[model samples]
Target: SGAIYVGNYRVVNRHLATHNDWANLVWEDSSRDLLVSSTTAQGCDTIARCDCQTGVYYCSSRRKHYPVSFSKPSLIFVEASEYYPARYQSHLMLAVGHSEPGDCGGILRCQHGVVGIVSTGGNGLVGFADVRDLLWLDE
Candidate 1:
């Protein structure tokens, strides 16, 4: 019904991936949950998984059921700061000027929505796979 926590900022996430698996199944046009689109060309006020702890919050990669709820999401990662010039879409997700590696399974919430799950990082930039494409391709 509302936004969830990523790192510290509260964000609306449609997917909390387990190593790239479709963890939060969302039907963009038909789904009932009121979630903002993660894709916003340049970017939005974003957030990242943070406080890397097990159970209450940690991370996942393979067949990890993790945890997602109409109540909240699961298999959480630690924390990440906001990024700028973020490009999130049904296909690609990217951002510039960040310190972390955009660690695996980390969600990049550009526009305050679940844009992409982190893939890797480098060259002073981080990349990811947008959730919308994943919901269609992976699902």
Candidate 2:
């Protein structure tokens, strides 16, 4: 199963975000239909249904039951290409903010809303160099 590892949390398919906060990405099957569950660092657990087939998503937390096209404006464009590769060609976005530990950056793979993060400096588990290799498209 595909997994997004951030800090001490390994977000695999169908698992609740560590600390009961956000709906982590579900990268197990890497198919059209997917389920997303994640909690914010402050503890806001949300469940969202995504259909990669049509590039749309419906979350139980917001609006009505209608699905919305994924386009998160807050996501910064981390310069890179192979980061997604030809196989996992999902829309990508990055955002920077503060977490429980301190300053942090988030990477959102929009096709399924799969998200990952790295903090200011390094978290040991994920290093900035690796993240830059994956996310930084430019020199």
Candidate 3:
């Protein structure tokens, strides 16, 4: 086995999301199709599934799915450098959080060496997930 590097940066994991399901699943939705969006808390990121018939968003981590409302919920990549550099470093994943006052919150986070969803927080938002492209800066 060998290693992958680019100048001062080195590849930590080739594909953290090995399973196709992890890559295919939706995580968030901002559309009004879900009727009404529920409020989410910080530091409580968990996988959930939404039922179109019922306008309810429940927390179900085992399912690893998100609801489809006005806009289809999906994973998005944000440059870890945009936020605090010491905390986020080179990690990139979804940017989940409260859009307005008293609204639900979600954030991309790292768990068990893989990237996943979690509640919004300064610490939780700093976790690293997958690294498929680019040469992330090494710490």
Candidate 4:
């Protein structure tokens, strides 16, 4: 309900992956949680709500779940340092799974609310699926 500071100078969203499955489940919108991308884009300065029961967190205005399921998850969060461009800020999660080769999972960018790229740690390494186009095609 107030200001929360991440004095660590960095914030991160970890991931969990499995080569056997060759894919992972990423963070998406849920009923009471969300994956947000910061406005400053400096770091994970925005905010999110954690769900102890689900062991997840929701960010910004999204009421969706951002699960933290990764044994050695490393959801890198890079913020432009004054001296350099940015540094890698990653860690591990113990709940939601991460993006795999062909799995339906991704990291949550609790900032301006961006899906793919930094959030997923692929950064254009994979092709993006347009929701609108896909929906239209399906329809």
Candidate 5:
């Protein structure tokens, strides 16, 4: 809600291209959990209904990044999912659909805190950097 603004940002550019994408990035501290996403619309709906306090925790990407929205957008909590990786596990997977290619750098929230950042995905999926990497230093 506009009344609940937590220092908003809306940086619109006039020269965005077909491959260009927008980002809603912010710097937030780890505290009470309210940030998150899910694979299905139903998941997001459930999160909204439950307000995610009791829900389980589960827990982004890059490209022509631009800043929009405020810090700490609200989200819901569910269950933390198990992930399987072949190599270089700096990213976590979130099953989000209908998202654009530019949504790559968006954050994945848990009922606890940030869990990942979108590094890839678009076809009924989006993969984000794991918090272990969010907090991915390329070490």
Candidate 6:
């Protein structure tokens, strides 16, 4: 949904940064939404409400994005979700740090204010605080 669309270009440029840039799009909490559906679909509408570890529910998105303040910016930061065609709608992806599969489930918190879900990677559960603390005011 960003700069280009499929079939718009005859051939994909090898060096084109088609898969970069986080600001160009937003993420959908489809994965967590699924979990919510399995449990209670009505309850998943509110983002940043679920905890990755225990699946406990919270009222704020921030509680799911950032767990604790890191002494420094984390070495493994989430690259903004990549957009793709899905059977339902737009799909997103996540890249887990240290190549840890477990981290993906931990980072994709519906609260990170991100949309959509990735089959793999570290974008599944985001920290609750990161999503809650975000304040985007238009000028």
Give all TM-scores, in the order shown: 0.30, 0.19, 0.19, 0.22, 0.31, 0.22
- Expressed as tens digits, the lDDT of each residue in 1-139 for candidate 2 is 2334433333332222233323344232222112233434332212223323222222222322222222232222222223222232123321221222222222223343333322212222211101112221111
lDDT of 4: 0.27
Candidate 6 lDDT over residue span 29-109, tens digit each: 432212211111122222332223322222122333332221111123323344332323112322222223222223333
For model 3, how big is the CA root-mean-square deviation?
17.1
Please give the lDDT score for candidate 5.
0.29
Cα error, candidate 5, residue 18 (Å): 20
Q: What TM-score, to 2 decimals, does candidate 4 have? A: 0.22
> In candidate 3, which residue ranges exceed 4 Å CA deviation?
1-64, 67-88, 97-128, 134-139
Name the regions of candidate 2 deviating beyond 4 angstroms.
Answer: 1-16, 19-54, 71-139
Candidate 1 regions with alpha-carbon error over 4 angstroms:
1-90, 99-102, 134-139
Poorly placed runs, candidate 6 (over 4 Å): 1-36, 40-45, 48-90, 94-96, 109-118, 122-139
Q: What is the clash count for each candidate, in the order shown?
A: 11, 14, 10, 29, 14, 27
Residue-wise lDDT of candidate 4 within 75-105, one digit each (tens)? Answer: 4444453322554433323333333332323
Which scores better on TM-score, 4 or 5? 5
Highest-TM-score candidate: 5
Model 1, range 1-139, lDDT digits (tens) per residue? Answer: 1233333122233332222223332333112111233222333323323321111111233222232211122222223324222332333333442323424445534323454444434565444434433323221
Which candidate comes out best when scored by lDDT? 1
> What digit string (tens of lDDT, one per residue) describes model 3 on residues 1-139?
1122323322222222124323332221111101111222222222222212211222232223333122123343323322222232132232332222111222222221112222122322222223222222211
